[PDB]
Structures are given as C-alpha cells and as structure tokens.
Amino acid sequence: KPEPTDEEWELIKTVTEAHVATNAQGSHWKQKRKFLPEDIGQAPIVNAPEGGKVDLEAFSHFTKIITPAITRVVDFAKKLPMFCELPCEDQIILLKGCCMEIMSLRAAVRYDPESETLTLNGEMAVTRGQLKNGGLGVVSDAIFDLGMSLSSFNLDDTEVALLQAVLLMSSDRPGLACVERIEKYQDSFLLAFEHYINYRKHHVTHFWPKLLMKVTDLRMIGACHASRFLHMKVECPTELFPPLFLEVFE
Numbered sequence: 001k002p003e004p005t006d007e008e009w010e011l012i013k014t015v016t017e018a019h020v021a022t023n024a025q026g027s028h029w030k031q032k033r034k035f036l037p038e039d040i041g042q043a044p045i046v047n048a049p050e051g052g053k054v055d056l057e058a059f060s061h062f063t064k065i066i067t068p069a070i071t072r073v074v075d076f077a078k079k080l081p082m083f084c085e086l087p088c089e090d091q092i093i094l095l096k097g098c099c100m101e102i103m104s105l106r107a108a109v110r111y112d113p114e115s116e117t118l119t120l121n122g123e124m125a126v127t128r129g130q131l132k133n134g135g136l137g138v139v140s141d142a143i144f145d146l147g148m149s150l151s152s153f154n155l156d157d158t159e160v161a162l163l164q165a166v167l168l169m170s171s172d173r174p175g176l177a178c179v180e181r182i183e184k185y186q187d188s189f190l191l192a193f194e195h196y197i198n199y200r201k202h203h204v205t206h207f208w209p210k211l212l213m214k215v216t217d218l219r220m221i222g223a224c225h226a227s228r229f230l231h232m233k234v235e236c237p238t239e240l241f242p243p244l245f246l247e248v249f250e
C-alpha cells in the first residue's frame with residue numbers, strides 16, 4: 001500500500017491548511033458552542049400535522065449564520081491553486097454544486113453523541129428536530145445519521161479536507177466547460193487521499209471503500225437540499241433569505 005509521494009504531501013499540506021483556515025476552529029468547537037434554546041423549534045400543538053412546514057423562528061436563526069458558512073466554503077476553494085485557475089463560469093457551477101455537501105460534512109464531523117446536537121458555523125448547537133423543523137426536513141436526519149456513523153472513522157483535518165476537495169472537483173456538474181481538467185484534479189486528490197489513508201493505517205478493513213460510501217452520502221444530501229430549498233421559498237417569506245443564500249442555491 002503506497003504512501004503519499006513528495007508532490008502529494010505538498011498538495012496535502014495545501015488542502016489541509018486551506019480547510020483549517022476556513023473551518024472556524026480557532027478554538028475547539030465543543031467549548032465555544034452555545035446551545036440553541038430548546039424552546040426554538042418546539043411545536044406548541046403536538047397533534048397538528050407537520051407535513052413539510054417550516055418553523056419561521058428557527059429558520060430565522062439558521063439564515064443568520066448560513067451566510068458566513070457559505071463564505072468559508074468559497075474561501076476554502078479560493079485557497080486551492082487548482083481551483084483558482086478554472087474559468088469563473090466553472091468556479092460558479094462547482095461552488096453551487098458542492099456548497100451544501102461540504103457544509104453538511106463540516107456539520108457531521110462536529111456531531112456530539114452526548115447532547116446529540118450538531119454544531120453549526122462552529123458555534124450553534126442544534127438538535128435533529130430543530131434543524132429538521134427549521135427548514136431542512138429529512139435532510140436534517142440525513143446529516144445527523146452521517147454524523148453518527150462518522151464518529152468511528154476518526155477523520156483528521158486532512159481526511160476531512162481531502163473529502164471536501166473530492167466533492168468540489170466533481171466534473172459531473174451540468175454546464176461545466178473544463179470537465180477533463182476538473183476530473184484530473186479530482187484524481188490527483190483521490191490518489192493523495194488513498195495514499196494518506198495507507199500512511200494513517202486505520203484499524204478497520206476496507207476503510208477507503210467505506211469512506212467513499214460517505215462521499216456518495218453527501219452527494220445525495222446536497223441534491224436533496226436543492227429540492228428542499230425550493231420548498232423553503234414557498235413556506236418562508238422572501239425577506240428572510242440572505243442574498244448570498246439565494247445566489248448559491250438559486
């Protein structure tokens with residue numbers, strides 16, 4: 001099992017630092033996180049159909065921190081030379097495509113089995129029901145389920161950073177111009193990722209193949225979020241949507 005080459009180690013240092021610099025982790029999250037009051041997201045009438053409705057109050061707090069979350073995803077990408085040398089038209093398509101896949105991953109790795117909450121933007125700990133009622137619906141469940149199964153993977157800033165790069169460099173997005181050049185960058189990351197996996201020597205058989213399944217989960221989530229955004233537009237007032245939010249998922 002080949003370990004990373006010299007060139008791969010340099011790339012690895014590039015993504016890892018890119019991720020860390022944009023992951024709102026100056027201080028460990030488990031300490032800076034404030035819990036969103038239990039009241040928020042709580043349904044007063046228990047027997048009233050939930051359907052696909054949205055808690056406006058909860059939705060309100062979420063949109064207030066979604067913009068800085070979206071920006072860090074942009075800043076992360078803009079720290080990778082491979083990405084910056086892609087046409088601006090491709091940079092847009094790629095960002096609108098992986099934004100939620102990377103954000104969901106970033107939330108999932110910050111899952112706390114104790115309180116059973118996800119820490120968003122590195123400071124807001126929410127429960128499954130809060131994020132579910134607040135707008136995401138089933139997508140909330142998808143992310144929590146992912147966070148539950150990621151705990152044993154013990155992913156470091158590098159493994160998480162490489163996962164983001166793989167998600168970012170997806171050439172299957174519609175309208176992309178440099179499909180080949182993007183697919184190549186993705187191969188370069190996948191390769192460095194696997195080699196780094198051999199270097200880490202995790203005590204779990206078929207760790208790489210199990211990791212790739214998680215990558216498929218995030219792509220399913222990001223796509224499900226797309227259809228979910230449309231619904232939010234119907235259930236929630238247009239004034240509550242930040243211009244950055246609209247731009248990335250419109």
Ligand SMILES: CC(C)c1cc(Oc2c(Cl)cc(CC(=O)O)cc2Cl)ccc1O
Pocket residue numbers: 059062063065066069100103104106107119120121122131134135136143
């Ligand atoms: C309810 C709606 C506004 C909404 C919330 C939402 O929750 C999140 C937020 Cl704010 C931030 C992150 C990433 C991070 O922790 O940096 C990750 C996640 Cl999952 C994602 C998409 C959405 O459309």
